[PDB]
Design a protein around this nucleic acid. Sequence first.
DNA 1: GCGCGTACGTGCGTTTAAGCGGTGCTAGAGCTGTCTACGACCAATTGAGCGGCCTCGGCACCGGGATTCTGATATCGCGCGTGATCTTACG
Length: 35
Amino acid sequence: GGVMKPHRYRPGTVALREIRRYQKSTELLIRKLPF
DNA sequence: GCGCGTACGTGCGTTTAAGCGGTGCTAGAGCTGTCTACGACCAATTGAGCGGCCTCGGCACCGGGATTCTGATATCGCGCGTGATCTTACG
């Protein structure tokens, strides 16, 4: 008796999700204080 | 198109300095009153750059000759493949 995990995403999908995510917003991306 | 090696994504785990707030100090930014130096302008003066017109040549052109460069070919060289001779093993 063990605990099993459902699945794993194929590569590149989250790349696209991030692409749309950051193409929708406008907030600055580089962190402020190091800059 | 096929095959092989792999850079890196997700995910997890862990770790950390990125933001809020809270206080405290203060630098130079900003706005009044003084004071003064200087650039436009007119007269009058003087002189320099532009254009016309002379003059002359550095370089294009021609022609010829001399020097270089790919493309093709062949030889030397090296490496791979096969048969002859010497060697070793078994029968």
